[PDB]
Design an enzyme around this catalytic site. Structure first.
Site, PDB file in Angstrom:
ATOM      1  N   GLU A   1       0.828  -1.190   0.000  1.00 31.66           N
ATOM      2  CA  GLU A   1       0.000   0.000   0.000  1.00 31.66           C
ATOM      3  C   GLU A   1       0.874   1.257   0.000  1.00 31.66           C
ATOM      4  O   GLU A   1       0.641   2.173  -0.793  1.00 31.66           O
ATOM      5  CB  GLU A   1      -0.937  -0.043   1.204  1.00 31.66           C
ATOM      6  CG  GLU A   1      -1.953   1.078   1.191  1.00 31.66           C
ATOM      7  CD  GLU A   1      -1.417   2.351   1.805  1.00 31.66           C
ATOM      8  OE1 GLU A   1      -0.636   2.251   2.752  1.00 31.66           O
ATOM      9  OE2 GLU A   1      -1.789   3.428   1.325  1.00 31.66           O
TER      10      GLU A   1
ATOM     11  N   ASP B   1      -8.445   2.414   7.795  1.00 34.59           N
ATOM     12  CA  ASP B   1      -7.108   2.961   7.635  1.00 34.59           C
ATOM     13  C   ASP B   1      -6.864   4.100   8.610  1.00 34.59           C
ATOM     14  O   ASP B   1      -7.690   5.009   8.684  1.00 34.59           O
ATOM     15  CB  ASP B   1      -6.889   3.476   6.216  1.00 34.59           C
ATOM     16  CG  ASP B   1      -5.427   3.648   5.847  1.00 34.59           C
ATOM     17  OD1 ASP B   1      -4.570   3.548   6.751  1.00 34.59           O
ATOM     18  OD2 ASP B   1      -5.150   3.892   4.656  1.00 34.59           O
TER      19      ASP B   1
HETATM   20 CO   LIG Z   1       1.102   5.262   5.758  1.00 34.12          CO
END
Ligand SMILES: [Co+2]
Length: 323
Positions: free
Chosen positions: A163, A210
């Site tokens: 990511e 997140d």
């Molecule tokens: Co980050």
């Protein structure tokens, strides 16, 4: 046929007070911290020992559970600023051949920093990982009945790799995992042997966690096509608070907001959203102060916030799956 439009009509089966109470009692912030979270608080960038132990830790935690979790490692190679690297997405699916899935996701990789301190990304995203694992566990008995009619719908979990960027964030240096897997799902028939329909049609809603772990987070409602689901989280948050099942929670410092967001946040949803998947993006605005900082660590996590968000997410998931 029209099964891909089913998600457009899908309603929650809403839990009453005693049910909410049981859910609040069935999660353990302490047991997550130790068994789910603490092991992830290591350097785990691609190719790292930590990468390998992170994976290991995730597969094992899902394996010990009764529910019929099927696991796949979507592993692949891609050029990076440091040269070719290996990435591995972890996919954990109940009822893999169900046409429809609610999808929880986060990224288990941690961003690369040089060092006497080391970057472990507690909020980013070891805590999203533990929360998904605590959910898997807290709801095991209820999720196990999905083995046994109803909508053709089950639960998927995704832990993305790659990511984070290696150098400076760019379309080609980030989202390695998500970009790979979304492309894969795009060209993979679902159900097996269908015409027209792909696995991406089978994604009912991508719930991406997140940057979760900081005190008083505030999540904006980012997307109209998921806004009805965001309202669920606000209603859950509200009801849990009124029932006395949250800790150090005030309506005034509530997490899920009425308002939206101006700019466009790049994250693992992006490759899914641009191909038309409904996204419920549970990232806060603003990001935790500790963002991309050596302080993104454990001391700086807030147990109660995580516990509160665990309860809210678990309730959401039960109601979405009608469990
Ligand atoms: Co980050």
């Amino acid at each position: 046929s029209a099964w891909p439009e089913e998600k457009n009509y899908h309603q929650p089966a809403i839990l009453n007070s005693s049910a909410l109470r049981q859910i609040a009692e069935g999660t353990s912030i302490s047991e997550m911290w130790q068994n789910d979270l603490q092991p992830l608080l290591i350097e785990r960038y691609p190719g790292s020992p930590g990468s390998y132990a992170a994976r290991q830790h995730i597969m094992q935690r899902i394996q010990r559970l009764q529910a019929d979790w099927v696991l796949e490692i979507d592993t692949f190679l891609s050029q990076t600023p440091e040269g070719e690297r290996s990435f591995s997405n972890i996919i954990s699916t109940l009822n893999p051949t169900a046409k429809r899935h609610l999808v929880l996701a986060c990224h288990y990789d941690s961003k690369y920093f040089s060092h006497n301190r080391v970057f472990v990304g507690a909020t980013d995203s070891a805590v999203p990982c533990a929360m998904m694992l605590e959910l898997a566990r807290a709801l095991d008995k209820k999720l196990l009945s999905l083995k046994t009619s109803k909508p053709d719908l089950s639960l998927q979990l995704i832990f993305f790799d790659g990511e984070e960027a290696f150098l400076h964030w760019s379309p080609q240096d980030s989202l390695y995992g998500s970009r790979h897997l979304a492309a894969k799902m795009a060209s993979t028939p679902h159900p097996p042997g269908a015409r027209g329909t792909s696995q991406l049609h089978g994604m009912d809603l991508l719930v991406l966690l997140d940057l979760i772990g900081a005190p008083n987070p505030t999540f904006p409602n980012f997307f109209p096509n998921s806004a009805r689901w965001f309202e669920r989280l606000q209603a859950i948050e509200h009801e849990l608070h009124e029932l006395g099942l949250l800790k150090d929670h005030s309506l005034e410092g509530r997490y899920f907001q009425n308002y939206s967001y101006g700019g466009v946040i790049q994250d693992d949803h992006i490759p899914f959203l641009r191909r038309g998947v409904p996204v419920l993006h549970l990232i806060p605005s603003p990001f935790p102060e500790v963002w991309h900082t050596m302080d993104d660590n454990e001391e700086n996590l807030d147990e109660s916030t995580i516990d509160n968000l665990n309860k809210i997410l678990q309730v959401f998931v039960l109601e979405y799956l009608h469990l």
